[PDB]
Design an enzyme around this catalytic site. Structure first.
Site, PDB file in Angstrom:
ATOM      1  N   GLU A   1       6.943  -1.071 -16.272  1.00  0.00           N
ATOM      2  CA  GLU A   1       7.417  -0.194 -17.332  1.00  0.00           C
ATOM      3  C   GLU A   1       6.285   0.154 -18.301  1.00  0.00           C
ATOM      4  O   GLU A   1       5.171   0.456 -17.862  1.00  0.00           O
ATOM      5  CB  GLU A   1       8.618  -0.838 -18.026  1.00  0.00           C
ATOM      6  CG  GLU A   1       9.793  -1.069 -17.068  1.00  0.00           C
ATOM      7  CD  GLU A   1      11.072  -1.484 -17.775  1.00  0.00           C
ATOM      8  OE1 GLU A   1      10.989  -2.200 -18.798  1.00  0.00           O
ATOM      9  OE2 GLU A   1      12.165  -1.096 -17.305  1.00  0.00           O
TER      10      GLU A   1
ATOM     11  N   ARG B   1       0.852  -1.178   0.000  1.00  0.00           N
ATOM     12  CA  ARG B   1       0.000   0.000   0.000  1.00  0.00           C
ATOM     13  C   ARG B   1       0.893   1.235   0.000  1.00  0.00           C
ATOM     14  O   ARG B   1       1.723   1.407   0.902  1.00  0.00           O
ATOM     15  CB  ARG B   1      -0.928  -0.025   1.215  1.00  0.00           C
ATOM     16  CG  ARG B   1      -2.199   0.754   1.061  1.00  0.00           C
ATOM     17  CD  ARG B   1      -2.974   0.244  -0.140  1.00  0.00           C
ATOM     18  NE  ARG B   1      -3.929  -0.799   0.222  1.00  0.00           N
ATOM     19  CZ  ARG B   1      -4.920  -1.188  -0.567  1.00  0.00           C
ATOM     20  NH1 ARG B   1      -5.064  -0.620  -1.759  1.00  0.00           N
ATOM     21  NH2 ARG B   1      -5.766  -2.136  -0.169  1.00  0.00           N
ATOM     22  N   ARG B   2       0.747   2.073  -1.028  1.00  0.00           N
ATOM     23  CA  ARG B   2       1.632   3.223  -1.174  1.00  0.00           C
ATOM     24  C   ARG B   2       1.632   4.097   0.070  1.00  0.00           C
ATOM     25  O   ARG B   2       2.692   4.535   0.530  1.00  0.00           O
ATOM     26  CB  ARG B   2       1.217   4.045  -2.390  1.00  0.00           C
ATOM     27  CG  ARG B   2       1.601   3.406  -3.686  1.00  0.00           C
ATOM     28  CD  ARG B   2       2.803   4.121  -4.274  1.00  0.00           C
ATOM     29  NE  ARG B   2       3.285   3.485  -5.501  1.00  0.00           N
ATOM     30  CZ  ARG B   2       2.584   3.356  -6.628  1.00  0.00           C
ATOM     31  NH1 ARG B   2       1.337   3.806  -6.724  1.00  0.00           N
ATOM     32  NH2 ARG B   2       3.139   2.769  -7.675  1.00  0.00           N
TER      33      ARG B   2
ATOM     34  N   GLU C   1      -4.210  -7.861  -6.857  1.00  0.00           N
ATOM     35  CA  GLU C   1      -2.946  -8.579  -6.814  1.00  0.00           C
ATOM     36  C   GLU C   1      -3.072  -9.808  -5.929  1.00  0.00           C
ATOM     37  O   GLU C   1      -2.548 -10.877  -6.263  1.00  0.00           O
ATOM     38  CB  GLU C   1      -1.811  -7.645  -6.328  1.00  0.00           C
ATOM     39  CG  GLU C   1      -1.416  -6.619  -7.389  1.00  0.00           C
ATOM     40  CD  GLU C   1      -0.469  -5.528  -6.865  1.00  0.00           C
ATOM     41  OE1 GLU C   1      -0.285  -5.416  -5.629  1.00  0.00           O
ATOM     42  OE2 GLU C   1       0.097  -4.787  -7.702  1.00  0.00           O
TER      43      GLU C   1
HETATM   44  C1  LIG Z   1       0.288   2.725 -12.862  1.00  0.00           C
HETATM   45  N1  LIG Z   1       0.412   3.186 -11.482  1.00  0.00           N
HETATM   46  C2  LIG Z   1      -0.736   3.089 -10.476  1.00  0.00           C
HETATM   47  C3  LIG Z   1      -0.560   1.821  -9.652  1.00  0.00           C
HETATM   48  C4  LIG Z   1       0.518   0.953  -9.864  1.00  0.00           C
HETATM   49  C5  LIG Z   1       0.644  -0.208  -9.059  1.00  0.00           C
HETATM   50  N2  LIG Z   1      -0.253  -0.463  -8.122  1.00  0.00           N
HETATM   51  C6  LIG Z   1      -0.150  -1.668  -7.355  1.00  0.00           C
HETATM   52  O1  LIG Z   1      -1.045  -1.745  -6.412  1.00  0.00           O
HETATM   53  C7  LIG Z   1      -0.300  -1.509  -5.115  1.00  0.00           C
HETATM   54  C8  LIG Z   1      -0.408  -0.160  -4.751  1.00  0.00           C
HETATM   55  O2  LIG Z   1      -1.752   0.039  -4.472  1.00  0.00           O
HETATM   56  P1  LIG Z   1      -2.264   1.464  -3.864  1.00  0.00           P
HETATM   57  O3  LIG Z   1      -3.733   1.462  -3.500  1.00  0.00           O
HETATM   58  O4  LIG Z   1      -1.379   1.892  -2.728  1.00  0.00           O
HETATM   59  O5  LIG Z   1      -1.970   2.446  -5.158  1.00  0.00           O
HETATM   60  P2  LIG Z   1      -2.681   3.907  -5.323  1.00  0.00           P
HETATM   61  O6  LIG Z   1      -2.223   4.795  -4.255  1.00  0.00           O
HETATM   62  O7  LIG Z   1      -4.203   3.747  -5.336  1.00  0.00           O
HETATM   63  O8  LIG Z   1      -2.242   4.493  -6.804  1.00  0.00           O
HETATM   64  C9  LIG Z   1      -2.968   5.688  -7.173  1.00  0.00           C
HETATM   65  C10 LIG Z   1      -1.943   6.680  -7.440  1.00  0.00           C
HETATM   66  O9  LIG Z   1      -1.062   6.120  -8.761  1.00  0.00           O
HETATM   67  C11 LIG Z   1      -0.930   7.113  -9.600  1.00  0.00           C
HETATM   68  N3  LIG Z   1      -1.446   6.746 -10.888  1.00  0.00           N
HETATM   69  C12 LIG Z   1      -2.731   6.519 -11.251  1.00  0.00           C
HETATM   70  N4  LIG Z   1      -2.749   6.202 -12.555  1.00  0.00           N
HETATM   71  C13 LIG Z   1      -1.463   6.245 -13.028  1.00  0.00           C
HETATM   72  C14 LIG Z   1      -0.813   6.016 -14.283  1.00  0.00           C
HETATM   73  N5  LIG Z   1      -1.569   5.646 -15.504  1.00  0.00           N
HETATM   74  N6  LIG Z   1       0.535   6.145 -14.360  1.00  0.00           N
HETATM   75  C15 LIG Z   1       1.259   6.481 -13.300  1.00  0.00           C
HETATM   76  N7  LIG Z   1       0.699   6.703 -12.104  1.00  0.00           N
HETATM   77  C16 LIG Z   1      -0.662   6.583 -11.966  1.00  0.00           C
HETATM   78  C17 LIG Z   1      -1.686   8.386  -8.962  1.00  0.00           C
HETATM   79  O10 LIG Z   1      -0.806   9.212  -8.475  1.00  0.00           O
HETATM   80  C18 LIG Z   1      -2.530   7.819  -7.774  1.00  0.00           C
HETATM   81  O11 LIG Z   1      -2.436   8.711  -6.639  1.00  0.00           O
HETATM   82  C19 LIG Z   1       1.178  -1.992  -5.421  1.00  0.00           C
HETATM   83  O12 LIG Z   1       1.315  -3.406  -4.925  1.00  0.00           O
HETATM   84  C20 LIG Z   1       1.335  -1.878  -6.685  1.00  0.00           C
HETATM   85  O13 LIG Z   1       1.950  -3.047  -7.336  1.00  0.00           O
HETATM   86  C21 LIG Z   1      -1.311   0.341  -7.927  1.00  0.00           C
HETATM   87  C22 LIG Z   1      -1.496   1.516  -8.667  1.00  0.00           C
HETATM   88  C23 LIG Z   1       1.690   3.771 -11.012  1.00  0.00           C
HETATM   89  O14 LIG Z   1       1.779   4.141  -9.866  1.00  0.00           O
HETATM   90  N8  LIG Z   1       2.778   3.849 -11.950  1.00  0.00           N
HETATM   91  C24 LIG Z   1       4.041   4.430 -11.492  1.00  0.00           C
HETATM   92  C25 LIG Z   1       5.038   3.272 -11.180  1.00  0.00           C
HETATM   93  F1  LIG Z   1       5.214   2.459 -12.263  1.00  0.00           F
HETATM   94  F2  LIG Z   1       6.250   3.829 -10.845  1.00  0.00           F
HETATM   95  F3  LIG Z   1       4.519   2.516 -10.156  1.00  0.00           F
END
Ligand SMILES: CN(Cc1cc[n+]([C@@H]2O[C@H](COP(=O)(O)OP(=O)(O)OC[C@H]3O[C@@H](n4cnc5c(N)ncnc54)[C@H](O)[C@@H]3O)[C@@H](O)[C@H]2O)cc1)C(=O)NCC(F)(F)F
Ligand SMILES: CN(Cc1cc[n+]([C@@H]2O[C@H](COP(=O)(O)OP(=O)(O)OC[C@H]3O[C@@H](n4cnc5c(N)ncnc54)[C@H](O)[C@@H]3O)[C@@H](O)[C@H]2O)cc1)C(=O)NCC(F)(F)F
Lengths: 140, 140
Positions: B39, B9-10, B82
């Site tokens: 990527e 969880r971020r 996941e």
């Molecule tokens: C694709 N992505 C979102 C994501 C990736 C992986 N997860 C898995 O799921 C768990 C985390 O879950 P968690 O609930 O904590 O995630 P969120 O906080 O909800 O993300 C929401 C925030 O992502 C950003 N957001 C949304 N849309 C995009 C987009 N199209 N591109 C880039 N950022 C994006 C906004 O800024 C939100 O604010 C982990 O186990 C991960 O494996 C969840 C979400 C990224 O981040 N990419 C950047 C990197 F590659 F470096 F990770």
């Protein structure tokens, strides 16, 4: 004699402090963090001497990390004590910004307001290798 | 194909997740964590593919890490997706407990309640090298 002392708040920066420890050791630095090198004896004097002994003072500014310092004019908060020691000894202070909100200086005890005047490094979750490389550049 | 997928969880587990990634790579495991190996392309497919590809599924149970999974019956939450992917592929699931409070199974969607039945490793700030050594024991 460790080259780096890591000061952090348990309830908010334990994981980042530990991560900083691992990276800095991989790059050849001797690191003091309490859970690895605070050993036997009276810990108040052992902590102070460990700050004094280390050239670099890495301060983990997690969110709220200086809250317990506010109004701590008797200097009984341990992060407060460590910072005052680092300031008083002219340490190379390298703050690490991890969600920290920059406070108005006047809310902090006078003896540690100077910590806010040091150049801080932003912790980047997405670019951690580059954050580490920059921290290494800041170390002496 | 990485051997280990780290789900986290971020907003509460980013630091531990990166700390786990560093340690596991130091001990010779290929590790997927999104900030290092997610990527180009449609990330829905790439994330699920990366879970399916990894023998071990290391799940960082920071405080409240499954809160957003609760009532996510359409499976929109990413830790939910996941976990379900890991459970469906029979992966070696290794929960890492870091101040996580065990919920009653019924508060979680039925497709991921099974995650609670997996033996989890307590993250010990004071005994981190011992925690890591236990984690490597759990991995295949
Ligand atoms: C694709 N992505 C979102 C994501 C990736 C992986 N997860 C898995 O799921 C768990 C985390 O879950 P968690 O609930 O904590 O995630 P969120 O906080 O909800 O993300 C929401 C925030 O992502 C950003 N957001 C949304 N849309 C995009 C987009 N199209 N591109 C880039 N950022 C994006 C906004 O800024 C939100 O604010 C982990 O186990 C991960 O494996 C969840 C979400 C990224 O981040 N990419 C950047 C990197 F590659 F470096 F990770
Ligand atoms: C001595 N000590 C307390 C301490 C050490 C270092 N700091 C520095 O100060 C920053 C952290 O400050 P923070 O404000 O976040 O921590 P506190 O909440 O104030 O500590 C209070 C908690 O320690 C425990 N506690 C109290 N009294 C003892 C005792 N006699 N023995 C063992 N635990 C004790 C209580 O159970 C509280 O739960 C860091 O930069 C550190 O360098 C602050 C406090 C330890 O931990 N030793 C264990 C280890 F060596 F592994 F670290």
């Amino acid at each position: 004699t460790p080259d780096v002392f890591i000061s952090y708040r348990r309830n908010s920066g334990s994981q980042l402090a530990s991560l900083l420890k691992v990276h800095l050791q991989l790059h050849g630095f001797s690191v003091f963090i309490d859970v690895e090198k605070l050993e036997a004896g009276k810990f108040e004097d052992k902590l102070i001497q460990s700050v004094m002994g280390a050239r670099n003072f890495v301060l983990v500014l997690s969110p709220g990390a200086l809250d317990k310092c506010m109004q701590d004019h008797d200097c009984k908060d341990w992060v407060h004590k460590e910072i005052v020691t680092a300031l008083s000894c002219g340490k190379n202070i390298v703050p690490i910004i991890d969600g920290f909100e920059w406070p108005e200086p006047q809310v902090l005890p006078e003896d540690m307001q100077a910590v806010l005047t040091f150049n801080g490094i932003k912790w980047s979750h997405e670019y951690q290798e580059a954050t580490i490389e920059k921290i290494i550049r800041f170390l002496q």
